[PDB]
């Protein structure tokens, strides 16, 4: 979904799926700003990745020889791409990675080839963390069980395999007759437009359901467990995910059904105490008032449009990263985990 | 108005056209009634019955028979034809069962042929008064300036007028009390963002739209004070069957500890069952979950699960509101010591 050409970045326009597989050639630091706010590219990690190739690109365009000045401008761009979308850290996390990869550059020309290797490197280890999460999480389910998910934490949300979908892809070979239930994550339908398309495009047993049906499906389909990705995880353990995730957790807990949050180490924010202090992005009201040019509610009806909710660690049965499975006491587990 | 009986035609508002359009239709055939109902041009537990009833009567028109028992004899074929439209709502059953019972001791084909129309009008108006009564009955449950959340569209176009769950809001507007209602779009058919948001707006009712996937978060962030929905069929023990999505609002509600309320006219009841788990949950066309108003949202061919209703077990309901009053505890007996007559 994200591919780098030292001249530009070609991204799969995620808005179009499942209808068309369009590719756009982002070449300007503003073409990237837009690709993000506009959701042409989404998924905490994939988003972090393009953010990086963004600075990595707008930088060659930077003219001069003063390393100190170069880094002044570089910072304005970083604050710009970062102002794009909040709630997930993967964005500013990848940005930091880069603006530090040049805290001791002697020249500029190097610092420019520096940023790129970093960005190209951030993307390489994304395949690695995902393959791991796919493999660490699969330990949780067995042959036969039907698992639910939300949003689209798959191949195009990351680099490959994904986080919460990763195990499905793996359970496939193993021939684990895993039956998935994906919810059409409204309003942006990242679930019916991406998660159904992808999993089907790979021969996984998916079944699409509206967000509402969540509970009825849990009862009459005997859901076995729930796994979702993340956008930001606090020291506390509280996790920030697609609007709707919280409801499934509290709803899942009622059915005493396992709630898993699959997410990379880069999705954690050690600086933040709990979830309640994680800024939730509210997007354009029209995301709820119309779709593909067709109005679905009174044009001026007031709307509450939050993109993410928070799931208190009290609701999480386990957390999966490239390191393993911290099934509880996520406060401490993380301080241990975190190091370097 | 919702459903209008002429003496040779039923005029329904095409609800699948809203919110951008308000077109009406001239139903003439029992074929036309069957369609409208099944394709949701007309929906809402009561409105449905109002139509099935009227429709049946318009049917019993173009049917020649000197005989009374020959008229009745084949007069089910119609009842059955329509009753086989949509399963879940117990109002379509109830509303046909009534019409077929009020011609039992009919002495002439023209008598019944004419009693039916009177019966179907008896039913519509009765509803208005019972919607007006539930409205008042339920308004006692909310203080002023509180945030209520609903699902589906149990209002005036779903009923003859006033509604059941929405009733209390029109009335609150009257007594002027700061009610802010939160309507979840209610997918797949979207009667929430399309029907509810649109009428409450007309009536200057303070409304805010949210996708179904925002129940929980809105509950915490917005501090919603209560929840109110409206059945399609209630079981002899409190177990209510309402539009898909209600069961979770119930579970969530319980979790946030806020009152969950059901508003249903007496007819929306079905004492002849022991619980909801035994209530026929309709399942509609898959392409309903695969798109949004013509716009394909998912890859066609993607397997879909599409139940139209779910079941909220009585011990999750903080109270049921009827035209006769409120019930707060043992529903099984209360429900029993009511249909007593």
UniProtKB/Swiss-Prot annotation, chain A:
Temperature dependence: Optimum temperature is 35 degrees Celsius.
Top EC class, one word: isomerase
Record family assignment: Belongs to the eIF-2B alpha/beta/delta subunits family. MtnA subfamily.
Residues at the site labelled Transition state stabilizer: 151
Assigned keywords, A-Z: Amino-acid biosynthesis, Isomerase, Methionine biosynthesis
Chain's role: Catalyzes the interconversion of methylthioribose-1-phosphate (MTR-1-P) into methylthioribulose-1-phosphate (MTRu-1-P).
Pfam families noted in UniProt: IF-2B
Protein's UniProt name: Methylthioribose-1-phosphate isomerase
Active site: 231
Signal sequence extent: none
pH dependence as annotated: Optimum pH is 8.1.
Xref: NCBIfam families: eIF-2B_rel, PRK05720.1, salvage_mtnA
Catalyzed reactions: 5-(methylsulfanyl)-alpha-D-ribose 1-phosphate = 5-(methylsulfanyl)-D-ribulose 1-phosphate
Subunit and partners: Homodimer.
């Amino acid at each position: 979904s994200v591919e780098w050409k030292e001249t530009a970045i070609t991204i799969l326009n995620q808005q179009k799926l499942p209808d068309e597989t369009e590719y756009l050639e982002l070449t300007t630091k503003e073409d990237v700003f837009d690709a993000i706010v506009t959701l042409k590219v989404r998924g905490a990690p994939a988003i972090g990745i393009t953010a990086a190739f963004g600075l990595a690109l707008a930088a060659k365009d930077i003219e001069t020889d003063n390393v100190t000045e170069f880094r002044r401008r570089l910072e304005d761009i970083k604050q710009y791409l970062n102002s794009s979308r909040p709630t997930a850290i993967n964005l500013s996390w990848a940005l930091e990675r880069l603006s530090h990869s040049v805290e001791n550059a002697i020249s500029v020309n190097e610092a420019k080839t520096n940023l790129v290797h970093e960005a190209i490197q951030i993307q390489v280890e994304d395949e690695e963390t995902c393959r791991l999460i796919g493999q660490n999480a699969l330990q949780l389910f067995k042959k036969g069980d039907r698992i639910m998910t939300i949003c689209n934490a798959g191949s195009i949300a990351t680099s490959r395999y994904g986080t919460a979908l990763a195990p499905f892809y793996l359970a496939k070979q193993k021939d684990l007759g895993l039956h998935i239930y994906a919810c059409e994550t409204r309003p942006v339908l990242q679930g019916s437009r991406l998660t159904a398309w992808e999993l089907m495009q790979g021969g996984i047993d998916v079944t699409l359901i509206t967000d509402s049906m969540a509970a009825h499906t849990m009862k009459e389909k005997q859901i076995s467990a729930v796994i979702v990705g993340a956008d930001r995880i606090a020291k506390n353990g509280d996790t920030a995910n697609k609007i709707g995730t919280y409801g499934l957790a509290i709803l899942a807990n009622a059915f005493d059904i396992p709630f898993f949050v699959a997410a990379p180490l880069s999705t954690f924010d050690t600086k933040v105490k709990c979830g309640a202090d994680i800024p939730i992005e509210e997007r354009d009201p029209e995301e709820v008032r119309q779709i593909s040019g067709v109005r679905t509610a009174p044009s001026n009806v007031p709307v509450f449009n939050p993109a993410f909710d928070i799931t208190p660690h009290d609701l999480i049965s386990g957390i999966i990263t490239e390191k393993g499975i911290m099934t509880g006491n996520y406060e401490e587990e993380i301080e241990q985990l975190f190091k370097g």
